[PDB]
């Protein structure tokens, strides 16, 4: 059985008010089919501007991060409550920039995800290995460890996992212009799906979306989208460009 | 010679869209004199809502945090460029919640501050010791170390320091309802001003604002404001309440 395809655009720390207005309008003007989930994640200060600019009935706005506590004395942090008050359904958790550059631990990412999921959000949960870890032949060990941390907070819970979208982004592919080959990406996605079937649920493994990120763009996404276990993309740099819309079209054509 | 008094309200991780609209309107309706700087720092997702609600010609909106890189691949982070594009002049850097709970290092806080100052922002730079550090009689050593980290990035630079407001908030006073006595606070502020005179500039020490935070509220702020070296307040919990306006009035009456 199959999955609703998913494409997310992570703007990261980019944008101005004028850009958000113009780019969100451009995406919203694209004919987005009802058969694919399309989500964009502007920087936190731009979320309300993006929501106001979003005239699409399909496009959804997401956050790039959320904290693991509710409202309270957490200077600089955003709560799930704040995001839901703004009408958001989606949030990115555990992006490799936060894990590897900003010191977000496996347990911290897992706790953020659990809190968001328990409150009814859809979490795009990111995992991935560094070039060093892949050279050491620890690719699956690393990715599985990141997921087992979420598993520790959610276990086998049903429908905690229902609204998880796993995003595999090899760290060596992020912003480097070095995309994983379809073979390399599919191999990891197969491994993640086997892990899910074994440690969570066999039926659940058939339904969970596992998307690929890391230098995914309009030129390479068709071949990735043709891989049985790659349900779509988490797009960084290309999400700031008109080619993001081309990717939506390619994903639709290849997987619906 | 003397200082323009400064009062900042840090909302921390609190608020909904409706609250921001209503509370910013309430503050903006207060008669704020031209003689005092009054700044409020909503959560990042609420900044644009607060800016739209702010009809005051005196009140300024500030951010609670900013990253130490420009725009780029920093998922979950906000750049100085983004804040300036939104028209903001002020940012809180090095809040003790970020230092002590979220692992922001002295050097990281210093680098954030330097970047913001170089771009023309006013930085509310927070320092403070824990109860453990004070028990160990290391209060001044800790606070000075946090400032020397900024000094390392700015040195004796003129007018890098011109737009710094130092905020002393003993960690044991944050959200605990245990305010420092005027005697305790003034003693630290004297120490910080002596440090500034010795390590930065004697004339500069006469002009830099050093504000107190940590359970400051409408009931205790007059006695603090009467201390020669306490130029105002960084207000947490009370900034979410109507008593914030009472504090503005008390600060004006005591220091102008």
Author numbering:
A (entry chain A), B (entry chain A): 2 to 257
Paper passage:
TIM is a ubiquitous glycolytic enzyme whose active site and overall α8/β8 barrel domain structure are highly conserved; even so, structural differences in its interface region have been used to achieve specific inhibition of enzymes in parasites. Since Giardia lacks oxidative phosphorylation and depends on glycolysis as its major ATP source, it has been proposed that disrupting this pathway could hinder the survival of the parasite; therefore, glycolytic enzymes have been considered potential pharmacological targets. Our results indicated that derivatization of C222, a non-interfacial residue located near the surface of the protein and 10-15 Å away from the active site, specifically inactivates the enzyme. C222 is at the end of loop 7, with its lateral chain positioned in a hydrophobic pocket formed mainly by carbon atoms of residues N218, G219, E223, F234, M248, and I251.
